[PDB]
C-alpha cells in the first residue's frame, strides 16, 4: 500500500465525520465486517458425517 501512499492527498483535515462514532485516541476496535474469501478444499472423508 506504498503506492496508495504516493498517489494520495493524505490530508488530515476532512469534512467527513460520523457523530454516532466519536472516540478519543484511546479507543481501538476491530471492524465487525470481516473480509474473507472462499478457497477450495478437499473434503476430509476421515470425519464421517
Amino acid at each position: 500500500s506504498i503506492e496508495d501512499y504516493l498517489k494520495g492527498k493524505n490530508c488530515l483535515a476532512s469534512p467527513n465525520y460520523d457523530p454516532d462514532d466519536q472516540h478519543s485516541s484511546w479507543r481501538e476496535d476491530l471492524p465487525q465486517f470481516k473480509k474473507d474469501r472462499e478457497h477450495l478444499t478437499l473434503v476430509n472423508t476421515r470425519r464421517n458425517r
Binding site: 474473507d36 474469501r37 478457497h39 477450495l40 478444499t41 478437499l42 473434503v43
Partner: protein
Amino acid sequence: FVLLPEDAKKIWADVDKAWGLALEAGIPHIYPWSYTQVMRDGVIYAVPKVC
C-alpha cells in the same frame, strides 16, 4: 485439470491460486473444469481457519 487422482492436492492448490488471480483481474464468469473430477475429488469451498 486433475488427471491421475493421486495428484489432486497440488493441482487443486494451484487452482486456488489461479482463481485468486482471476478474481483480482475481474473476470465475470469462472468455471471449474469438469463435473467428474469435482465429484470424484470431493472439492468444497470454505473460509480458511483463523489460527
